[PDB]
């Protein structure tokens, strides 16, 4: 509950010095990042309750790991980003997680690499004095996740995403950013690329296209399936 | 599912049956907050909301029916919550209680805050309004209840504009600024609260205890606790009044 | 005529030290600020003439008030209103005038008291650098208005549009009324920002003198309203 | 205290059709409009005194002429002007008043011809969704005023900068200056664009009252100068 | 070299040496129009600089020395030539010449308009003046020259303003709304012409003539021609008075 | 000279229906258009003359190649790449050019892939009514320029670039632009990668470092040799 203490001090995480791995996996919901720990990492422990913002360290193929829930949005995901890389010392941030495909050849269960973010957010306007800032992937984790995804033949779309501020929007214009490439929706990446970009950290965001605004019926051994993929993609990509 | 192009009214983040949530509801930031004050303050309380951990919860309070919602931080989560609860749920009264940090030389740590508008660097409202500036307002006879109830337990109770800020972490708020034009204290999400609750006929407050403050008092876990209760209270008085 | 003297030096009003009470009235045209004056004050004395812009001290309730014209717009309140609070020291301001509704349920001859004022100037904007200012009213001052509308027996309370445009061809007036928004004026949003910023205490009441749907009174009813606006500015200004 | 009717109704003047003349001159202060139309004018009527903005028809060298008072800033003088062009047929306006220089080559007295206005309200980008327009004087009005001058032996001819905010804590003028902006006042930016919407003539002609270095005469040379500034904006007006 | 980090007065795009450029310079975008002018108009013209193939000539016009230097399209590249004329070569007076689209009715294929001002949609005012609208303007005494040599030559000569564009191709140029307040002709140049001018205390006027018309006339090669040699020299006559 | 034809009648390109290879390399000099048609196209003609910005065909490894002139800023190339796309078909679009960078790891006649460009232009501003627009590469192109430049061991770095409006700036604030891990300033890439988006073309720009905000001397032998590698890195991403 203290407002004016550092990023540094991390308030919103209550794990000591060490805990939390250089490499990290940032799913949005918490009790997605308790089944990541649950189910790929061997030894996990929990770290962090605070807001029961669920965070887990464990190890993948020998390299440690940690996978830290976010919350919904940019001001949510940019207290967890700025606590993790200034009080923790973290590294290389991996997003994983939906969207909402805005393209007709776009699929339901595809995955996407956000090789970039558009955004509605006002926080880079007010940074950059009404100027446009780019927030970009980490190329060679891009590229990393992408060669992984050829390796496990998995239809893999690289491309552009919008970070929404506003889930229900009035005025999406979605149109507009379709006919400019934009491939899906989600709330997260344009505040973890800018972030990341800021302290020389590595961010790329791989996400499964959960919905789409034209089109289809899926299950859950579906869903847990592409599910699985994605984590797996990301979990290369991180220890690579 | 992860569905992003349902309407709010199929709520696809609050997993409560039709009717499981009251009319009238307490919205803390932090879901183990809510749990708590259900825990403490409500009648016969039940969790009807487990979806991303976010807890719901129903009870009654002086024989009133009252919910209790976490609403995770910041403009853009509370605004999905507060959109599902108005629009799927048929909420209308909505108290915020949380934290503020206080930014002005004469609000002190413990104050109890009542929201009466609250300025933001979100750009939610520049986009509604095509760059004009659309003013977020608290419900007044919810405010003045509030502060009547405040004056009924001798509490201080400090009337005004609060700031809702995008990022907890800024290189440049400019405090002296916002400090200069009389805005209380900081959170991150009363703007939102009050558009959405304005654009859908709905009622709302925000009741907040000063947590922090820019130019300083330490505080004792009894002192904040009881301070906590008597947050709550004010606010569980001014939803069923 | 002079351009970069301070507020301090009163550059528009006409007054020496000590002329000003600390509660003044703030209706936008002059001569109905001599009406007031002449109405409603005991012992009206006029202390400015410069461009018009009639001012009044008198006694109300054995307590001092000036009543002074604001012209229309921010630009013109926001002159009269950093003179009177820089080099008078008025300490509580209160709005008096008309506005044009925008709501189905709130009718021509209701009086609105401005909790707070979303506007179209750039005053704030170019402040804030971009971010939005919220002007919001003195909660004391607003408070006891509304109690004494209720003693009275009249009152809606809640966010008024203060425009830069009379005529604008691109109003959107139903998304402002979607978003709660009573009423257009056109100097609210600045008393309420330059109050707060010098610590001053400031409130709108408001008389709703036409609406976009009726498009709408004879003049003993309109006269009779502002009379009880009138009375409830002073109240406030007094408690 | 209509909101919703057009400006062909004429909301804030109380004239009747044909009162007002083709050809306007618009001083700011209307107790100014009044000395002009006795001064300089044969046979001035007034025939507007609505909120104290006095207007007067008059003649000079057998033209028919008014006079009408704007009060202060962008959007009051947006009233005044929309309702003279879309109600009376005003064809021709010329504003006079006064600037403060914020260049070191302009002096006090001086008498600017606003060739364009630069300005900080936010009338043009809610017009023009965020673009830049430039809001420009006539130019046969602008070079008639010139040569008039000339003729009269007085002239500089350039931008200035209307200004919403008199007291402004960051008003730039060095930026400004940089880029050429002789002077500041409150209303040319609104009347240009007004006008040029309408189809009209519109010229400011303004007279140096201070300055922001030497800070800045005797009652006798601003009255002077002033009516020098009076015969070149009558003589435009009519040739 | 290709650096990007030296000064203007450094005149990096530009390959003359000192004193090559003439005090007094015409500005066509089109360094082929810019030869044309040189050897059709100029006595004694030689080229100074073939950078970029971005020709410039020297010669004289009536005894005076005069230059013409292509400027290429659109607001950063005339903005490039325009910093490094004035801050290198001490150029003082600015002669655009050019065409331009009209949008009113009553402006026709093959009038020469005289611009007095510029609006724009390039963002490069609204970050120098941090949002605030500055209007970039002619200087008066050239404006009044070109106007009374048109006069002198019994041409139309329209006056007024101009839209400097930055999307030759815009999906959303609302010209009714331009046309409407006034603009008589889209270009891409005048707005930084006239800022940069005024910044550095310099003389700048666009004398265009119109080749389009949103609504519309076709003309001959001839037509073109003689109007072309009528703007080049009302432009001439306004340099060197 | 006539302003209201519409790019598909691409008044400034004298080009015949066809004389435009699909695929392009666009400088910014047309006398460089003219250096890379004689030295690394076979049978090269020229298609344009217009305005002076000479483009020319040619073929490369048996592959039909264009190279186009495309003057300076975002508003000269965006008149160009229309009338390319919207009246010729160019579907593959890749930029060379220079940059100056700002970043104290980045050294002159260093090759810079764009990944993104951030920008001062108001043109995305306008379409996206005021939201940020992440203009982005192709990343096909991207990942095959990064690989050949692998194969010829050049010093390759891959992130964002900044589009200026203003060559002369007196407020760039380069200092916060890097500290954001902007790698470079040029002119021409964020108006590339929106139109490329907007018409569906793949864009790259592949960019030499030839000034740097704080360092370095080069000679004429040493500016040329890495202008022909840059050269080689874009003819091969364009063919392949
Ligand atoms: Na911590
Ligand atoms: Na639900
Ligand atoms: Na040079
Ligand atoms: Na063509």
Not at 33 to 57: D, S
Not at 90 to 114: E, M, N, S, Y
Request: charged residues 20%; proline residues 2%; hydrophobic residues 45%.
């Amino acid at each position: 509950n203290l407002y004016f203490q550092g990023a540094m001090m991390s308030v919103h995480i209550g794990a000591k010095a060490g805990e939390i791995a250089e490499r990290i996996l940032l799913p949005g919901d918490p009790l997605r990042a308790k089944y990541i720990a649950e189910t790929f990492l061997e030894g996990a422990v929990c770290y962090n309750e605070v807001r029961g913002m669920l965070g887990f360290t464990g190890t993948y193929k020998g390299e440690r790991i940690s996978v830290q829930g976010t919350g919904m949005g940019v001001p949510s995901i940019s207290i967890y980003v700025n606590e993790l890389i200034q009080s923790y010392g973290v590294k290389t941030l991996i997003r994983v997680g939906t969207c909402g495909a805005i393209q007709p050849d776009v699929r339901v269960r595809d995955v996407i690499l956000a090789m970039s973010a558009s955004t509605d957010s006002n926080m880079n306007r007010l940074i950059f004095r009404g100027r446009d800032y780019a927030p970009t992937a980490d190329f060679h984790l891009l590229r990393t996740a992408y060669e992984v995804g050829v390796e496990k033949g998995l239809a893999l779309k690289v491309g552009n995403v919008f970070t929404a501020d506003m889930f229900y929007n009035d005025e999406p214009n979605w149109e507009t950013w379709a006919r400019y490439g934009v491939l899906a929706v989600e709330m997260e990446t344009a505040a973890l690329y800018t972030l990341a970009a800021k302290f020389g950290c590595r961010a790329l965001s791989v996400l499964t296209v959960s919905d789409h605004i034209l089109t289809e019926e899926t299950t859950a051994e579906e869903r847990q399936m592409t599910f699985n993929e994605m984590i797996e993609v990301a979990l290369e990509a991180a220890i690579r």
